[PDB]
Design a protein around this nucleic acid. Structure first.
Length: 68
DNA sequence: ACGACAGATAATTTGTCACTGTACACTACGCCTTTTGTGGAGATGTCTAATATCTACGTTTTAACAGTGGCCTTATTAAATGACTTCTCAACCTTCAC
């Protein structure tokens, strides 16, 4: 059933801030650079943003917020 | 792309040790109520054998006397006594004697 995110920490808000920018509809000719302009503000390599968006789709806002 | 090798790295628990909040300060099984089955007199009710009493049952004994039954010989003549009965209870005249 439903899992609701609450008490998001500020680095999770940073994760939200990229996710809300990647939510603009894109294609391979646009994903790569619109990802990279986020990777530079995540300050971490592209593949982590891939796992971030993976977990975001896999679990939502509670996917980008770490589980103990 | 993603995810897939060996290894980094942010947790996660294990273990130290300075610090502090707290009890020890004697102070619950005890006060009080109700039910309740067991128990001790103690007034009262229960109801008999029996040793008379208390007359009668009537039943013996007495004597009094009543009735039955046996016996008792009968004659004559005399006497005494007491009685009974019957009969009787004249009257004038003549004759011879003094």
């Amino acid at each position: 059933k439903n899992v609701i995110a609450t008490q998001l920490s500020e680095e999770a808000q940073v994760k939200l801030e990229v996710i809300q920018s990647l939510l603009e509809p894109c294609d391979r000719t646009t994903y790569g650079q619109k990802l990279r302009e986020a990777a530079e503000k995540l300050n971490v390599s592209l593949r982590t943003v891939q796992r971030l968006v993976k977990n975001w789709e896999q679990d939502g806002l509670v996917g980008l917020t770490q589980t103990s």
